[PDB]
Amino acid sequence: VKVHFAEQDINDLKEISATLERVLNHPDETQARRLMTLEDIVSGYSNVLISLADSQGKTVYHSPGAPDIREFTRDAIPDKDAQGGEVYLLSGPTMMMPGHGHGHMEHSNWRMINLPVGPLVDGKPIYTLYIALSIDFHLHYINDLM
Amino acid sequence: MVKVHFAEQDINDLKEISATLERVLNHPDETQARRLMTLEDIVSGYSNVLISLADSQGKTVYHSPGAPDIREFTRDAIPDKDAQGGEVYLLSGPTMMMPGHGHGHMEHSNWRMINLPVGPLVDGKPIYTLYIALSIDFHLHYINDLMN
Numbered sequence: 001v002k003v004h005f006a007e008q009d010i011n012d013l014k015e016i017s018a019t020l021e022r023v024l025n026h027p028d029e030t031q032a033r034r035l036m037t038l039e040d041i042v043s044g045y046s047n048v049l050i051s052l053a054d055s056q057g058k059t060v061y062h063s064p065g066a067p068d069i070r071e072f073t074r075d076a077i078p079d080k081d082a083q084g085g086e087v088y089l090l091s092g093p094t095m096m097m098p099g100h101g102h103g104h105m106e107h108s109n110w111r112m113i114n115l116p117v118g119p120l121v122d123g124k125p126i127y128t129l130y131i132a133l134s135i136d137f138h139l140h141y142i143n144d145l146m
Numbered sequence: 147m148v149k150v151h152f153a154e155q156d157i158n159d160l161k162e163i164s165a166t167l168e169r170v171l172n173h174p175d176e177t178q179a180r181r182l183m184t185l186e187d188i189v190s191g192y193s194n195v196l197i198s199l200a201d202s203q204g205k206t207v208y209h210s211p212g213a214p215d216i217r218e219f220t221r222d223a224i225p226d227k228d229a230q231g232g233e234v235y236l237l238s239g240p241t242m243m244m245p246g247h248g249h250g251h252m253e254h255s256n257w258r259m260i261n262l263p264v265g266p267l268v269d270g271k272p273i274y275t276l277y278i279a280l281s282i283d284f285h286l287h288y289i290n291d292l293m294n
């Protein structure tokens with residue numbers, strides 16, 4: 001079941017990465033307009049955090065409602081259950097989930113991927129996008145059995 | 147336990163889809179035409195969800211373009227035994243058209259379905275009934291694989 005859970009998330013992340021890549025390289029729109037559009041889409045997922053990094057490795061944008069996920073990417077553990085690799089496990093940060101009162105499932109465990117995105121300057125992608133998807137529901141199911 | 151867990155995964159996704167589309171269809175600043183245009187723009191982007199919107203008389207006003215109207219499969223709907231509470235159904239159709247071929251092609255013909263009243267009120271009753279169907283084929287592929 002662990003490999004199945006990894007495949008579920010990888011499918012989701014593949015789709016999310018395609019959507020956000022297209023957003024960040026949408027023709028005839030400024031950076032401001034693209035980041036506004038991206039934030040609205042990311043907010044719509046409700047179980048996703050992102051961070052956008054420049055060529056030096058400085059964060060130009062990250063999602064509200066949580067600390068920058070780049071503060072947890074350097075101690076990310078490679079995911080053993082992801083065949084093909086390039087998927088990482090994050091032990092934080094905790095994401096705020098308002099609107100439901102007390103007892104909502106905690107979102108502080110993630111599967112992470114990253115890819116080059118954004119307009120080319122020149123022929124070369126300016127940004128690197130980090131995408132984190134909550135895996136806490138997976139981890140609670142596994143922990144509750146044992 | 148894993149079947150019940152798969153149901154709860156789906157129910158959670160359906161809850162969020164329900165809340166998003168509910169806001170869209172009774173958004174205070176917009177006309178009914180603008181709201182439906184917003185619905186269609188959002189819904190067309192879905193990879194694994196079909197929806198159908200019925201009017202006051204139970205006639206379909208809108209449904210997703212990738213497949214036949216899911217309300218045509220209401221007559222074959224089975225209560226979801228793994229959904230322990232509420233009104234969740236299992237549909238064994240329709241097939242949703244998906245892009246690509248080979249290993250990359252997504253086979254989507256099995257659904258968990260819910261419905262709710264939606265839209266602005268007329269005579270103290272919402273004008274629409276929204277039907278939402280989420281793909282469960284990946285759940286079934288896993289279970290059928292274990293059974294050999």
Ligand SMILES: [Ag+]
Pocket residue numbers: 046047048095096097107134
């Ligand atoms: Ag969250």
Ligand SMILES: [Ag+]
Pocket residue numbers: 005137138139141151155
């Ligand atoms: Ag899970």
Ligand SMILES: [Ag+]
Pocket residue numbers: 193194195242243244252254281
């Ligand atoms: Ag589909």
Ligand SMILES: [Ag+]
Pocket residue numbers: 004008152284285286288
């Ligand atoms: Ag599954």
